[PDB]
């Protein structure tokens, strides 16, 4: 008995990994922010972004999300205001582990806007 050849591969499989954690940050009503981060994963994993319990969407220029080949993950907040201020959440999750990490973002009014 015990006809079964079992195959196996011979690639690399590795878990990711935050190098860095995204420190938090006050702006005023209109400016901008970055948020970034350092993972290493093989093969690189999926990147999820939460605030205030509110899944964040990229289709806007007020929103942007890359990542590097060094694994350095940045999000760009533009135009931000009270409103869009809250607490961030991203996860990124591989096959082989997944990891998730909390940040911290403030807004303030500023003293004069564009007026008619």
């Known amino acids: 008995m015990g006809h079964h050849h079992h195959h196996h591969s011979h690639e690399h499989k590795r878990a990711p990994m935050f190098i860095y954690k995204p420190q938090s940050k006050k702006v005023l009503e209109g400016d901008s922010v970055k948020l970034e981060c350092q993972i290493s994963a093989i ?49 990124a999750v591989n096959e082989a582990g997944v990891t998730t990490c909390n940040t911290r973002l403030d807004v303030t009014a500023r003293p004069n806007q564009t007026l008619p």
Do not use: C, H
């Open 43 to 91: 093969p690189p994993p999926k990147l999820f972004w939460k605030r205030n319990n509110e899944m964040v969407q990229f289709n806007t220029d007020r929103i942007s999300l890359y990542q590097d080949n060094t694994g350095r993950v940045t999000l760009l907040i533009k135009d931000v205001n009270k409103k869009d201020a809250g607490w961030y959440t991203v996860s």
